Amino acid sequence: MLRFVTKNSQDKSSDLFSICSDRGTFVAHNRVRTDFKFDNLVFNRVYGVSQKFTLVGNPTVCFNEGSSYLEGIAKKYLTLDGGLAIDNVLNELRVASHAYNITSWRWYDNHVALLMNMLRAYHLQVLTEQGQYSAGDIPMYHDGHVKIKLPVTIDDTAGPTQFAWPSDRSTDSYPDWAQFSESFPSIDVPYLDVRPLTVTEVNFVLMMMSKWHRRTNLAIDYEAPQLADKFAYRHALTVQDADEWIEGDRTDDQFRPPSSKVMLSALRKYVNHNRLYNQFYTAAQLLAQIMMKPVPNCAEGYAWLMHDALVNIPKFGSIRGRYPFLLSGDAALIQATALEDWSAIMAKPELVFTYAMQVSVALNTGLYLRRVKKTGFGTTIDDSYEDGAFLQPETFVQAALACCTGQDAPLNGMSDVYVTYPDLLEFDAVTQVPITVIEPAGYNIVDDHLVVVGVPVACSPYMIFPVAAFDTANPYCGNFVIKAANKYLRKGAVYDKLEAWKLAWALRVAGYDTHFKVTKFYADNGDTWTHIPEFVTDGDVMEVFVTAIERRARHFVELPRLNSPAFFRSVEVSTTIYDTHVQAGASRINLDYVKPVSTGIQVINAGELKNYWGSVRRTQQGLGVVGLT
Amino acid sequence: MLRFVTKNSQDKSSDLFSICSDRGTFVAHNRVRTDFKFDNLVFNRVYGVSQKFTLVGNPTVCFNEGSSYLEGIAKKYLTLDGGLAIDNVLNELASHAYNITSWRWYDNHVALLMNMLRAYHLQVLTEQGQYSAGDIPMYHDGHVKIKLPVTIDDTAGPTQFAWPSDRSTDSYPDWAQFSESFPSIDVPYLDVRPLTVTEVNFVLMMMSKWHRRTNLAIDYEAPQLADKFAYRHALTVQDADEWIEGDRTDDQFRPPSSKVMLSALRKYVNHNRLYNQFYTAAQLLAQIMMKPVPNCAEGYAWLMHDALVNIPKFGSIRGRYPFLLSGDAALIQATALEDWSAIMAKPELVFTYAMQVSVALNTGLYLRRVKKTGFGTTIDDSYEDGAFLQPETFVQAALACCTGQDAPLNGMSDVYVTYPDLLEFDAVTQVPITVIEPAGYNIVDDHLVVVGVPVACSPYMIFPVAAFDTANPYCGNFVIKAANKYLRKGAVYDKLEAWKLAWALRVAGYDTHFKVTKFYADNGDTWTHIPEFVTDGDVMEVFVTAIERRARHFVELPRLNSPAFFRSVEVSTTIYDTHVQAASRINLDYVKPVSTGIQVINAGELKNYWGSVRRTQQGLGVVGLT
């Protein structure tokens, strides 16, 4: 995850932003300078381009059965090829079978749900103490023309301002827990080791073991039942503050949730003690992938925002506190990527939020990129693009990321886990958008409802600028030249679709709107980005007519008559970012703090694609899932 | 015109057809086999095509005098040019010597010969039993109902050929009998000695004013050719005189039969040696005769448009002196002589040539309009105003641009059949339309409009027509080539290649769509009109989408639209049997003319317009016979 953010070490550094949001949303400002080079002299415009992101979401959770993983177990009981040694654990058990039949049969170690719960609680408490925790509210689209407003399940103003405990006292049951220090396990039941945790951190862990009530519209407050019906924890001291709060003995005031630092320390201690590096890596990946979506500045863009995601979080199971000697020894085949990403998150916890911000934009753009690159602008005859990585729900987000940006998207590192949108597997997926009553201008409104085909572009690429989405030079590349039209006639300046869009974008930045035929280039002011129109994607057309290029009221850098001969000059456009700052209502990272803990940790760089330890690579032939090498 | 008709197909064929009408219209049926050879798999489909024609028309005729032509007199009575040898005449015979100083020699009988031609054709038509007023066909296509008006109603219209004039209701020429050697008045006289009594009667009485009584194009109105004249005959003929003074009843004095009328024509021409003037008369009659009935809806603008004809005023010096027609006839064109021999061998050469010239004229005008844009033609020649300005070379230029061979010129100066309102490419027509159901049609205010000239016929009376330099459906055969580029939804195609592909698929049985929607092709002709949108400029590529099949399908073909399934389909079309229905093959070796007693010149004079116009590579232009 860290390498993806740093673009494989851009000058061995990158930048991060902490989580901040008001009313469930936050703007993401930018400052850029766009050049215009014609007549061998340079003009420029410095403009502020913003981008709205929202934390509001309602994903569908699926706490179904999942496989077991024993990576953070001592090297002498695990093995790369020999796997789990049941003979060694029976010998060291201290007949054998008499313990086998009791509990030694399950072997269902998996804490992904617990780690995800602790992470989302940390994020929610961060928002709480920043004075910004509240019920979500999706923004409205006021543009004089057709207006969009969406509902929320919980009202913002009545919504809670404080992150209380997820579960509600005196309404639902809790898992039955009791401290357990016996060497010999007695009941087949998850045993989780929390020995080195303080009273408050172990209290927080076992309280988050309970079930989760949703009290807000945010995407990370999803519903979650109790991870285990019964369980026991390996701790020297018997903790019952949570138990006292379960009954009326402890009041709400005296059992307030801890501060963000305490939850972060609890998570660090838990993962370090149980050697849960890969499991936490998967948990962070999933939480970031479900974190948020970008608020569109166009009308048809909200169709992407209407969709809800489906997540496969595995059912919880912990065999690490059953036997004290499991963790005695260096951990077995811990992935190097997991170690470095874990060190990066623990050093800077905002890395997960920044990666979520990058991944939302990359995925939303890459879905459009794949719906276009399948047909290749309609000059691909067969189906030899091999976009099949989009099919299996696990490599959905990874394939979208790889298609949008050339970088290797990081696989989830875990089997039967994914974040997927089932209804958007196919690119000819129609969506309906509830729409208020205002006269139209060619937004193909049907029965007072925007009909949207496929998935729309809903964000500017200004947080991943070198995206290289297209092969040719374009605004996504950043620097491009504007060439003369293919041939000039009465209708005017036959232009190829992609080059026509490039010209339209450059003129819209420069202050001239353009008129097309087979009518203008509806864009956004705040975000002077002009999203690619449907004439590029439809593939029925290959040349387009630009009739007239007019002057907007907000004039800017002056250009000649581009759409006519003897007056056109081959201007070229280059933009650079001056200042970016995610405000609402930064922290530099370099590869100096990446150095992971290698003391008593066996590290394998190689991975097997069966467990999804790899990275999907986009090539010209198409996407492709590649191992970690 | 014999060379033109016998060269449209081959020197051996020489196929002729007789005149036939069915309420003024007739249909010419054909039977044509189309091949489809690809991957050494020859496929074919035999089908019948029908192109109907109409004889109904209302041409405008102007009777304006022109040059005087004397190319039938003896050698000694002519100078080095067409002017008569007045000194030789006088040294042969006085007051006349002094009178001559005031005797202009205007001898031109083209109006008379044309009148006899149209009267003969009308009599043939009425003895065939189908002469009538003539009515335009009523075309209806499920979406649009059209019916062009005609002046004379068919039902009340006469069924028998009445004499063109009335019962002494109008004045008649003051004819006279001449037998002396002294012309008394500068008024023209004729020499009709070899003619019989009834032939002379028909000639003199038809000289009188002609009235238009039917919608037939050859039944145009014409005034009396001369107020006064005399005929040099052995005896006075006065039966038509008794008819005008109101003595001979209609039953005994009726228009003569076709045979005797043609015999009068023959005697007149070959005694006065009017081969050149008769050739001009036949040319004009052929160019005015008929038009094709359009299968497509918008093609009726061709029907509504009326030609303009310039017939010279009637004048005669043949009958003034009796020795002029003696001696060796001088300055007779070989083409005129052979055409005369052929038409008197069979009198329906004029009809078949008229049908061919009608089809060629329509196609030539339409292909001039199309090739203006740049469709099929490399050079942007001055198709608009080059050789179409000269009214006498208008129809010949159209024929040359259509067919590619040498169109025969009128052979006479200041005579033409010209459409003045057709030189512009912006000319519009308001065809009346009762629209049945709305569809793709530019219907504004009860009349659709057309631009320029439309297609109203199909190139089947003349099939091997070489309209374009490259292979095309107009040519015998063409090879469908690979598309310029293939896309997901289809492939782009050049204008001409796309039209060739669409034509071949329509013959095979596939309906072809395109964008920037249908390639129109009516049943009963299965010829695909050039699409309107691709006709204009600034369009060089056509996107072909959705090559769907039709209800009836004959030859099963590859897609030719997808790169995987495209195959080099080579087509070939040949016409096997034609039969008009309201042969008659000619034999050149038996119709060869009389070379004795006639002086024949191969060459002509460009002033008199004795030549032909050929579509050169660099541009069509008039050339001499040499």
SS (H, E, C) B412-445: CCCCCEECHHHCCCCCEEEEECEECCCCCCCEEC
Six-digit token string for A491: 């209708």
Six-digit token string for B86: 């007045």
Residue A220 DSSP one-character state:
T
SS (H, E, C) A406-426: CCCEECCCCCCCCEECHHHCC
Pick from B488, B515, B566 the residue to mutate for testing the A interface (most A CBs within 10 Å). B488
- Which chain A residues have a beta carbon less than 8 Å from that of B543? 540
Exposed/middle/buried for residue A201 (C-beta within 10 Å: 0-12, 13-18, 19+): buried
Is B24:B130 a contact under the CB 8 Å cutoff? no
CA nearest to A492 within chain B: B538
Exposed/middle/buried for residue B333 (C-beta within 10 Å: 0-12, 13-18, 19+): buried
CB contact under 8 A, B488 and A542: no
Is B494:B550 a contact under the CB 8 Å cutoff? no
Q: If contacts are CB pairs under 8 Å, which of residues 511-540 in chain B contact chain A?
A: 515-516, 538
Chain Cα centroid distance, residue B21: 17
CA distance linking residue A480 with residue A502, whole number of Å: 8
Is B23:B134 a contact under the CB 8 Å cutoff? yes
Six-digit token string for A393: 């729900």
Nearest Cβ partner for B489 among A378, A490, A518? A378
Q: Which residues contact A193 (CB under 8 A, 6 or more apart)?
A: A233, A234, A273, A274, A320, A321, A324, A327
Pick from B486, B489, B539 the residue to mutate for testing the A interface (most A CBs within 10 Å). B489
CB contact under 8 A, B515 and A489: no
Is A157:A234 a contact under the CB 8 Å cutoff? no
- Which chain B residues have a beta carbon less than 8 Å from that of A491? 538
CA nearest to A380 within chain B: B488
> Given phi > 0 = left and psi -120 to 50 = alpha, else beta, which region is B147?
beta
Q: Is the dihedral of CA A407, A408, A412, A416 positive or negative?
A: positive
Nearest Cβ partner for A381 among B486, B515, B538? B486
Six-digit token string for A408: 């290797």
Chain Cα centroid distance, residue A75: 34
Whether chain B has a CB inside 8 Å of the CB on A380: the answer is yes
Six-digit token string for B362: 């329509």
Q: Is the dihedral of CA A110, A113, A114, A118 positive or negative?
A: positive
Q: Which residues contact A251 (CB under 8 A, 6 or more apart)?
A: none
CB contact under 8 A, A379 and B488: yes
CA nearest to B489 within chain A: A540
* Gyration radius from chain B CA atoms: 27
- Which chain B residues have a beta carbon less than 8 Å from that of A376? 488
CB contact under 8 A, A518 and B516: yes
Chain Cα centroid distance, residue A350: 13
CA distance linking residue B566 with residue B480, whole number of Å: 10
Q: In terms of Cα–Cα distance, which of B428, B412, B417, B310 is closest to B358?
A: B417
Breaks (C-N over 2.5 A) in chain A follow: 94, 518, 585
Q: In terms of Cα–Cα distance, which of B12, B250, B208, B15 is closest to B112?
A: B208
Q: Is A49 helix (H, G, I), strand (E, B) or coil?
A: coil
Q: How many residues does chain A have?
A: 629
CB contact under 8 A, A381 and B485: no
The strand ranges marked E within B39-162 are 41-54, 60-63, 139-140, 144-146
CA distance linking residue B70 with residue B82, whole number of Å: 6
Nearest Cβ partner for A378 among B488, B515, B563? B488
Q: Is the dihedral of CA B148, B150, B153, B159 positive or negative?
A: negative
CA distance linking residue B334 with residue A46, whole number of Å: 88
CB contact under 8 A, B487 and A381: yes
Q: Give the up-direction half-sphere exposure of residue A170: CA atoms within 13 A in the CB hemisphere.
A: 7
Q: Are strands A310-312 and A60-62 parallel, antiparallel or unpaired?
A: parallel
CA nearest to A491 within chain B: B538
Q: Are strands A141-143 and A145-148 parallel, antiparallel or unpaired?
A: antiparallel
CB contact under 8 A, A540 and B515: yes
Name the minimum distance, in Å, from the CA of A366 to any CA of chain B: 21
Six-digit token string for A608: 């097997």
CA distance linking residue B51 with residue B29, whole number of Å: 6
Q: Which residues contact A119 (CB under 8 A, 6 or more apart)?
A: A267, A283, A284, A287, A352
CA distance linking residue B427 with residue A10, whole number of Å: 70
Pick from A540, A541, A547 the residue to mutate for testing the B interface (most B CBs within 10 Å). A540
Q: Is B8 helix (H, G, I), strand (E, B) or coil?
A: helix
The residue with tokens 């864009």 is A523
CB contact under 8 A, A540 and B492: no
State the greatest distance between any 2 C-alpha atoms of chain B, in Å, as a whole number: 96
Is A347:A220 a contact under the CB 8 Å cutoff? no
CB contact under 8 A, B488 and A518: no
Residue A616 DSSP one-character state:
E
Query: CATH number, domain at A569?
Result: 3.90.1840.10
Resolution of the structure in the document, Å: 3.2
Q: Are strands B598-601 and B329-333 parallel, antiparallel or unpaired?
A: parallel
Name the minimum distance, in Å, from the CA of B427 to any CA of chain A: 22
Is B486:B562 a contact under the CB 8 Å cutoff? yes
Q: Is A395 helix (H, G, I), strand (E, B) or coil?
A: helix
Measured CA distances, A313 to A158, A192, A230, B82 (Å): 31, 19, 19, 111
User: B45-73 burial, b if ≥16 CB within 10 A, otherwise e?
Assistant: beeebebbbbbbbbbebeeeebebbbbbb
Q: Is A468 helix (H, G, I), strand (E, B) or coil?
A: coil
CB contact under 8 A, A381 and B516: no
Chain Cα centroid distance, residue B103: 37
Is B599:B332 a contact under the CB 8 Å cutoff? yes
- Which chain A residues have a beta carbon less than 8 Å from that of B538? 489-491
Q: For residue B41, what are the β-bridge partners?
A: B38
Q: Which residues contact B101 (CB under 8 A, 6 or more apart)?
A: none
In chain B, the number of structural domains is: 1
- Which chain A residues have a beta carbon less than 8 Å from that of B492? 542
Pick from A377, A381, A497 the residue to mutate for testing the B interface (most B CBs within 10 Å). A381
Give me the torsion for CA of A293, A296, A302, A303, rounded to 10°. -70
Q: In terms of Cα–Cα distance, which of A518, A491, A516, A517 is closest to A505?
A: A516
CA distance linking residue B78 with residue B86, whole number of Å: 8
Domain span at residue B21 reads: 1-626
Name the minimum distance, in Å, from the CA of B490 to any CA of chain A: 9
Is B78:B70 a contact under the CB 8 Å cutoff? yes
* Gyration radius from chain A CA atoms: 27
CA distance linking residue B44 with residue A161, whole number of Å: 84
Residue spans of alpha helices (H) in A256-318: 260-274, 277-290, 302-306
H or E element at residue B624: strand B620-624
